[PDB]
Design a binder for this molecule. Sequence first.
Ligand SMILES: Nc1nc2c(ncn2[C@@H]2O[C@H](COP(=O)(O)OP(=O)(O)OP(=O)(O)O)[C@@H](O)[C@H]2O)c(=O)[nH]1
Ligand SMILES: [Mg+2]
Ligand code: NA
Lengths: 129, 17, 996, 210
Amino acid sequence: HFEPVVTMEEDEEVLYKVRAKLFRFDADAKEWKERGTGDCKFLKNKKTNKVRILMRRDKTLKICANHIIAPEYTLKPNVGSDRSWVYACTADIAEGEAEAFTFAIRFGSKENADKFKEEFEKAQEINKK
Amino acid sequence: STVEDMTKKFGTLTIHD
Amino acid sequence: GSMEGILDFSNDLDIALLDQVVSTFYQGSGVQQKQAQEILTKFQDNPDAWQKADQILQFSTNPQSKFIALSILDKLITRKWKLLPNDHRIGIRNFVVGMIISMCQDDEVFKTQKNLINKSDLTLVQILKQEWPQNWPEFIPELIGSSSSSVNVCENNMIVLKLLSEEVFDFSAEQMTQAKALHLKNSMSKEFEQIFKLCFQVLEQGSSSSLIVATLESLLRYLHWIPYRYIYETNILELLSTKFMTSPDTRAITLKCLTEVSNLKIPQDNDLIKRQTVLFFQNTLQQIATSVMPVTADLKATYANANGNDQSFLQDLAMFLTTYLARNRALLESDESLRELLLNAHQYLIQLSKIEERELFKTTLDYWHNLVADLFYEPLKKHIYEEICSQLRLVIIENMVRPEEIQLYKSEREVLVYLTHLNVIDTEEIMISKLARQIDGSEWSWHNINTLSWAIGSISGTMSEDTEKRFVVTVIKDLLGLCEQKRGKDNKAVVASDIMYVVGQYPRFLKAHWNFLRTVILKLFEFMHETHEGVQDMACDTFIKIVQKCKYHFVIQQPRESEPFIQTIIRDIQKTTADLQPQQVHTFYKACGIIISEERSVAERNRLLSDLMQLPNMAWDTIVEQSTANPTLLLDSETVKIIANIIKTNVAVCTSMGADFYPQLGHIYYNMLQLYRAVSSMISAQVAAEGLIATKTPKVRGLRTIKKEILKLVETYISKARNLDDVVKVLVEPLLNAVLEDYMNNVPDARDAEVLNCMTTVVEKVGHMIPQGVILILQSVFECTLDMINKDFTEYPEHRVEFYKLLKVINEKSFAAFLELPPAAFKLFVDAICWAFKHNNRDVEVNGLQIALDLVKNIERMGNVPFANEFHKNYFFIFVSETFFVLTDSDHKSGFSKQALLLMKLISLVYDNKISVPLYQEAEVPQGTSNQVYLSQYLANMLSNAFPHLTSEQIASFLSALTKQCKDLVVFKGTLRDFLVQIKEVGGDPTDYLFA
Amino acid sequence: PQVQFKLVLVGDGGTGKTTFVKRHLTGEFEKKYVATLGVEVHPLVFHTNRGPIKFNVWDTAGQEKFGGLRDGYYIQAQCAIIMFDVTSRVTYKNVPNWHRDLVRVCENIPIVLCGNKVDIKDRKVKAKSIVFHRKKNLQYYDISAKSNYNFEKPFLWLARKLIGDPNLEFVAMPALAPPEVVMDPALAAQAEHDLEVAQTTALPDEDDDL
Ligand SMILES: Nc1nc2c(ncn2[C@@H]2O[C@H](COP(=O)(O)OP(=O)(O)OP(=O)(O)O)[C@@H](O)[C@H]2O)c(=O)[nH]1
Ligand SMILES: [Mg+2]
Ligand code: NA
């Protein structure tokens, strides 16, 4: 007998995966600022059945969005785009400490955007319970 | 007809099983 | 807090407060740090701060505070030195020297404060640049003397000499006058005999390795300038190539010294020097083999492991080998006793070439290029390197890069091409067997089959046609077999793509075998229906790539075919392209346009053109009939896209067909310009109904897209048009009517910079034929664009760039248009040019200076006439002083050459008596006074006010030099550069401008 | 973290030093050129397989007349990035000046040379011309703060040299479960006002792929 030669997403399921660019609105200076570009994922916890948005920047893989898809939230259009949504978020923990944000999220096409909105609303229904 | 032979094989090239 | 106390100079400096502030800057964080930073910046920039520097060096215990005190000293020594009393200068020297001696005495401080010592050395060196050797004749003797006493002082003196060498020979060009650079070089050159003896003494005797390393550091610098005798007529080559290569501390620096030694200027006709150059290489390679690693060592593994200094050392070895062998390999190629040394040196390079490091690979690849080029051309050489070259073939092939990385891929292709010529059988064998190791799975991966495909593709056209034929057949057969083996769409897509890549790289083969070419293209058509990511783009890119090379075979009737294949392509074009995205369809149409341009029978070409444009023309006509019946339908964003896509299809075919596209342009031209207007009105309406934010909406951007693609189509045709009579008489007038007024009468945010771009081409090609048209373009775009871009340098960047392009071409092709401008608008033209000067943006700046130069030339060409007379009276000194402003302001250094050229031209006009009128107003100067004298008087006054710290003597000398040198541009430039140095300090030597 | 390294970032004005750092800190691309006065110290953390690694990034000023304690900023630096602009020939001509001033204070530190703004089509400093790094043993990368081309490379390389592990990789930082936070009416009106302004402010670069 020869002796032998010697992320915290584990517990979630992926409902939707889309490529996107997230912006936040600087209140004090009237302009948008990019927060990240990468895969935006809808992750349902297998315990709580709570769906969140989780988005990671490409390459560095730093979290640029982390919040519950609250059933109250409302996707609005942006005047300049037919492939974006803007909505208010009461608590995002991408940086760490919970903070409120006005987000916009833009996609490759109008189709991708429409599908996201449909998925966002599916997730809201799930979170109401 | 090694070229004709290869041309015939090319014509059945696919990305599918 | 109490931190801001040090900025109050009325009191004595509190050192305790200084050191706190410094600590709080270097060791602190957050709000604390930022406030101390502002305080230290303010303390340092206090012009009386140098006075309280000797206090800090003595009393402070914080090495950072001392370092900062020396920065303040440094600023005084380089700028305000010559203004000080002579006793202050001796004082400062004495306590800089003093501090250095005392720091070297204390081994504790010498070991643990190298930063502060090195800074003090640099500071000492600044003083030498001022005072040495005219006011310090004994510096070098006294340095060599004080070297004997303390090993530490000796070490520091080597650091001082290194820095002196750097400052005089390596970094003098930008930073001191020519006269002053020469003075210091001659001064160092004079006393170097004494310096070298001391260096060689230290190297031969050799106590402290830290001393030996610092001496070798200084030698590396000396090797940049010293004459070759010091290296070849002493023992120093033996020491470097043996002694110092064995211990790792000295190895690093020594290897760099021998690299520079390989670059020395050497007589090429002396056998004894040739043998010495061989010897130091033989010694070096021997120490490598016995003290570092043998020839067989896996350097790729070593480099990856990244222990200690291995990566730097392997980098340095590659630089040494490449440099030496580039210059000297011929010395090792005839003597059979040097044959082993030659191949071992090259075997190290083969091993270095396997290292996973892009920038290192480039260094070695440059050498391989030098080598294989030489083996291709030079007689009786290639046989020597057969085994080196065989290994290189595998190294290049396995590290072959995708064509997208253009510089690297090109380099790899050239080397591999040369290597294929030198031994085609070997190259083929290597490639076939690599392909076999893909098929059996042993080396199979996506990346691996990709790199092999890029490699096989690279050598297209090196083999004979016969060999190529058999090779390609084998490669394609095998790759086709590989595709069949593999399961899943992911795998098959990769191999199919590579199959299609190789085929596209072998047009000669395609041209000789029509049946095969036909089959390829039909297969690409099949792939245009595949949704799998990448496939449709691969199909389309390959199609146009094949066509670019094989087009003639698409336009003739091949034997056994019922028609030219272009006809077949056009018939099924709807079916072929049905699943492509718009911009893929456009590529397809462009490819077709390439083929149609080959048909030189006018009748048949026009017929093909109309057949190809069938779908877009029918879409077009239905949409023109619909939209002219009611302008409401253009709100519909679906209709906006369809329209934009028809125009783009026209742009694509026009791009590849150029002059041949005219009939198709004629089909749509009048309706297209009507569409432009209807679209134009639609945009204006939305902006009035919704505000400026309208211009950001999808609907309005859709509409603007239509206008821009229309402007693009017209620009594209006119730029390639051969019949300029039709351009003027059919196109130009409708175009100007459609676009000029619309541009002029829209709010700034609704104007398309593409209008300016289009007009630039129209003026470029046919401006000489439409004088009244060029006037109309200026009138419509000039004043209103200028108002957009003359408030800052940021807003409307495209308009800004296209504006100066348009004025440039107008000033080249139709200068008469500027003569028609009323004097007030001509004044804005001069304002606009001078405004371009002050830009950082290179496109604007370069155009600005060119317009200026060409304007001057245009005015010169007018001869002695009232407009030329009155141009000089009005605008000569504006151009001189505006050109001088950007030369001397330190914010437009990118533009130096053009500024210099402009200024020289302006000054040469007066020097040559080519301005007839006086440049001065009546009774401002005595009547008989020449322009020469007044120009000098004006410039003297101008520079005296702009730079008041300059002496009258300094300015007079500069202008004397500058005006005499206004025929020799490189010298003129030198004088300007001397002026740029002198204005940064006080008490510059006026004699410096006599340098020749 | 408390495994922190001082990084000095130097180069000519307008080369994109500040813009590069800001992209790493927030993800934003700044379009305006607001010249740095002296230096701004910015803590920057990466999560690796060998734990987290913090850089104290001393972003220094490129413009001569905003220079501050020029080389005073380099004292006790453990790494550096030298930045130039491949659209600007003079910013490469000055790379040896920056290096000279850098290695006189910091004698033995890992340094990366970055050629910024490769996103721009009309490149002035050609690839074949960039060779200064070879003899000075600098790592070189073509980068773009705008397109994010290679923007992570400089920090990954320095991370490897400083920790002394060639196999070190960036990994996905842990993603905690986010809260529920039902919203009060007390912050509704102020948030709604921001939303109003946001919808009627066009998103930038609408021509980009994302
Ligand atoms: N196209 C392009 N522009 C860039 C890039 N990075 C920065 N810029 C722009 O270049 C300008 C200068 O950026 P800064 O970061 O302020 O330059 P800096 O090096 O910090 O200048 P100093 O602080 O004065 O030394 C800004 O307008 C940026 O938007 C890039 O990758 N591509
Ligand atoms: Mg900055
Ligand atoms: Na190739």
